[PDB]
Amino acid sequence: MSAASSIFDFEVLDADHKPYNLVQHKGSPLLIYNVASKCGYTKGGYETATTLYNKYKSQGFTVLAFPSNQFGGQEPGNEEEIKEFVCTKFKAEFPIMAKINVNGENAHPLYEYMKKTKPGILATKAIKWNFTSFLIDRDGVPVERFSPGASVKDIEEKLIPLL
């Protein structure tokens, strides 16, 4: 990890567990969200990610979603939410990757890299919320961490210069 210098140093499998060509996105910025099953609420994160995706994908931009495998008690969000309520399969217009741990001992190394690069300002570098995102520059470097209730305008302040 000491030689990591961009997200493109990391292994990603798509939702069918095939190797995903992440470097295809190099040269243009992107937003990487962690997601989870649809229970009814995302703090605006679904709307924000979809809006930015559809607005800017023509300029080369993409949004990628990593769903949590919910394993181990320490994944983002409330662990009793999927126990208490019906939540269905996450669906979106943008790419969704295979399920991963984003916190804990088996945290995916891409997440360990983005979290330590941009630890955020609240509490520790752990991902606390579903629909947290990282803004990635043209070189694959994480340059901002956003909470899920970040507005389109707040993210645009950072993203438009990258475009």
Side-chain angles (χ1 to χ4, degrees):
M1 176 72 70
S2 60
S5 67
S6 85
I7 63 168
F8 301 118
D9 288 320
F10 300 90
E11 187 166 26
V12 175
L13 308 187
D14 65 25
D16 328 286
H17 284 111
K18 299 163 330 235
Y20 179 82
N21 195 177
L22 190 69
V23 82
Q24 79 184 281
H25 304 300
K26 180 184 197 156
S28 283
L30 62 153
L31 258 184
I32 304 177
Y33 288 85
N34 60 287
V35 304
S37 290
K38 176 181 63 177
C39 304
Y41 303 97
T42 63
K43 313 189 169 297
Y46 172 85
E47 296 166 78
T48 295
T50 295
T51 298
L52 292 163
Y53 183 65
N54 286 327
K55 184 129 89 148
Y56 294 111
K57 56 179 185 198
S58 44
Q59 292 190 46
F61 176 72
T62 194
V63 168
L64 300 181
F66 284 86
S68 172
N69 63 11
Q70 302 300 323
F71 184 62
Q74 76 294 311
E75 291 294 293
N78 182 351
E79 48 149 32
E80 297 173 7
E81 176 169 43
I82 305 252
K83 77 125 155 92
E84 198 177 352
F85 302 115
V86 170
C87 303
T88 62
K89 183 193 201 144
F90 186 63
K91 295 181 313 292
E93 274 193 73
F94 39 82
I96 308 158
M97 304 290 110
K99 290 184 150 156
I100 67 163
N101 273 103
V102 295
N103 299 322
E105 68 193 358
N106 215 232
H108 187 302
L110 160 84
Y111 263 84
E112 294 292 91
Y113 170 69
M114 292 188 306
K115 290 155 71 181
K116 68 149 178 306
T117 303
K118 307 293 302 183
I121 57 194
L122 164 63
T124 82
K125 65 189 155 248
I127 303 297
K128 289 158 273 289
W129 318 110
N130 286 139
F131 277 83
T132 291
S133 57
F134 298 84
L135 187 62
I136 311 305
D137 73 11
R138 321 189 210 228
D139 300 316
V141 192
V143 290
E144 314 283 343
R145 185 199 284 217
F146 294 100
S147 70
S151 47
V152 163
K153 191 58 136 149
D154 281 346
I155 294 190
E156 280 184 334
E157 313 306 89
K158 307 319 183 197
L159 172 61
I160 287 171
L162 283 175
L163 292 147

